[PDB]
Amino acid sequence: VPEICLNGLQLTVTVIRKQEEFVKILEGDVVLSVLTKDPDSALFVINRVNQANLIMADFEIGIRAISIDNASLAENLLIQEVQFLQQCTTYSMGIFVDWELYKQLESVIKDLEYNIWPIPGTRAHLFPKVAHLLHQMPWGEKIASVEIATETLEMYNEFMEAARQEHMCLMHFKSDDNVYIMFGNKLASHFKENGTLFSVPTDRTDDEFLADLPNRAFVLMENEIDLSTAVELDATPTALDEILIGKSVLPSRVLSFAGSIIDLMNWLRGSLSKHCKRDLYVLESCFNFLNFIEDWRTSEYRQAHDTAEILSLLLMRKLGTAMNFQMYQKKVLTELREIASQNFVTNVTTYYHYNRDNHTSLELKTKFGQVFNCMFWRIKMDT
C-alpha cells in the first residue's frame, strides 16, 4: 500500500495542510470525488441518495469532496485525486468538477485521462432568478442609466441573455439617474456613486460583506438552508449524518449537482442490473460493474429533471419552502431588511412592502420591467 493512501492529500499553501482540514470524507463502498468550492452542499446530496436508495442496492455511495478556496490550487488538487482514486480505491467512479473550475482547467482534464465530469453551472439557476426579481420590482417613472460591473465577461454574457428572455434591454445614457448592477462579492465594497446599487454576490457571504456595502444597496442572494435534524428534510423517516448537522447548504449548488447524480444513479441501476444479481444488489454478488463509465454523458442516459422532480425523488420535499432566491436592502437605522422572495420550486415572486409613515392605502408603483423594456458596449477594466 503506497504513501498517498496512508497520508491522504496534502497542500503547500508555506503551511503544510493535512488532509482532514479540507476534504469531508463520507464513508461508502463505491466512492466518488467532488472538486468544489461549496463542499457542504455536495455531502447533502450524497446523504439524500443513500437514504432514498436510488440504485436500490445494499452498498452506499461515498463522497470525498475536496474544498476549493484558491483557484490556482485547483490544478494541483486535480492531480492528487487522480493519483488517489486509481491506486487506493477498489471501486471508484470519478471526479466531479464545478463549471467555473471546469472551464478554467480544460487543458488539464484531457491530459489526465480519467473520468472527470463537469458539475453544471449554478448561474443557470441564479441569473434567471436575478432577472425575474428585477422585472417585477416596483420603481418610479424615470428611466435610468444602467452600468454593469462584473467579475468576468462570462457573467455579463449569461446575465444579458437572461435579461433578454425577460424582455429587458438595459441602456446607458448620459442621465442624472444611474443604476449599478454589480456581480461579485468584492466589487461592491464602499462604493461612492449616487445611483441605486444591485449587488449580486456570486459565492457565500461573510461578515465583511454585509458591513462593507453602501447604505440603501440591494443584495441579490440565495438563502443558505440550515441543516439541524432529519425530520425537517422529509416526513419519510431518514437520518442526517453527523458531519452535516450544523452546516448550511446552497440551493443553487444542490440542484445543479443533484441534476447530474440522478442522471448517474439511474445509469448505475441499469449497470448493476445486467452485471449483478439481486431484491437488493449485494456487492458480494456483484462482479465487473462500472465498465463503460463514460456512457452516461451520452444523451440516452442523461435526462433533464424538473426541480420538483428532484426534491420528490431524493426525499427532501420539505426543502421546497426553504429554497428561495431573495432580494435584501441594507438599511442602517445596520439591518438588511427584506424586499423580495422568489421560490425555486414554484416560481412565485413575492414582494414585501413595509407601510412606513402610517398610510391606510398604497398606490401601486409601475414595475421595473415595464419601464426598462425596448448597440455597442463600452468596457472599462478597473481595480
Place this chain on the structure above:
Amino acid sequence: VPEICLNGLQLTVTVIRKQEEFVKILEGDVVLSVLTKDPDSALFVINRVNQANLIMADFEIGIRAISIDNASLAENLLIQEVQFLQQCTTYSMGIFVDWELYKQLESVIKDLEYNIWPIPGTRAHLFPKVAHLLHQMPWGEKIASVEIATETLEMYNEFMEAARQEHMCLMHFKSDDNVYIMFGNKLASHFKENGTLFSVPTDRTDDEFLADLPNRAFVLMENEIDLSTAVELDATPTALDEILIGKSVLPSRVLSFAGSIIDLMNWLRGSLSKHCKRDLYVLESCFNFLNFIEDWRTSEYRQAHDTAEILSLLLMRKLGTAMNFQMYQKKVLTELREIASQNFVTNVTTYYHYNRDNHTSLELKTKFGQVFNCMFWRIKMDT
C-alpha cells in the same frame, strides 16, 4: 431541369434582386460556393489556384461567391445555395461560410445536412496586428485611462487576449487623460470626448467613414490591394480574370480563406490520385471522386500554413510588399496622413515621423507598451 437552375438565386429586399447583382460566377468544372461579406478576395484566391495547378488537373475550380451585406439575409441565402448545389451542379464541393456568419448560423447549418465549412476568422490576422502596432507606438510619460468600445463582446475577448500576449494590461482610472480604442465602422462617428481615439474598422471603409471621424483620430485598418494586371502578382506568367481587373482585395480575407483552400486542394490531389487516372488528371478519366468530403476537417489533412508559404505556393509572391496593416491619423489642415505600417509577411513594424517645425534632431519618445505594462469590468450598453 428545374426552375432554380434557370433563374438562379433571388432576394426580396421589396425589390427583386437577381442573381447577377450579388453572385460573381467564375466558370469552372468542379464548383464551389463562398458565402462572404467580401467577394472580391474570394475570387482572387480561386483565380490563383487554377493558374498554379495545386491539384495538377486540367479542370478548373469554379467559385459561386455570394455577397453578404445584411446579416439577416444570410439565413435565407444559405437555404437557396444548398437548394442550388444539390440539383443544378454535377460536381459540387461545398459552401464556405465566414466565421462571423458561421457562429451566427449554428442552428441552420446542422439542420441543412450539407458540406458547409467555416472560413477561419480574420480577427486572428488583425487583432495581433492591432496590438503590435499599439505596443511600439511613441507616447508621452503619462499613463492614461483606457475605455474600449466594441461592436460585440467577442471582439473585446479576442482583443485583450491579444493585448495580454503583447504584455499590455489596459486599466481604467479616474484620470484626466483618456484613451478610447473603438472597434467598428459605425462607432467613431463625430465623437465628442477629449481623449485620443483609436478607431479600428471591422469592414471595408467608404467615404462616409473618413469624413465622420474626429480630428486627430487614429485609424487602424489594412490596405486594400488594387488588382490591375497579372504581371504585378508574380514574375511567373499567369493571367488575371476579367471579373477581377479593377477590383481590390483584403489581405485578412485572402489569407484566412487561402489557409483553408490549400488544406482542401492538397486533399483533392490525393482524392484524384486513388480514384482517377492521369501526368495530368483528365476529368473524362475521373470517376467517383469527392466521396468522403468531410475528411479534410480531420487533422491528418488540415495543416497550418505560414503566410510566406501561402504566397509562394499560390503564385502571388509579389503581393507581400503590398500586404500591410497600417495606422493612419486624420489631420484636417482633411487628409489621413500615415503613422505606422506593419507588414504581413515579415512583421517589421515601421513608424513614420514627419519633422514638423524644422528640427535637426528628434528625441526618441518612450513607447506605449513600456508605459502601459503591468480586475473587474464595467460594461455600458449604448446606442
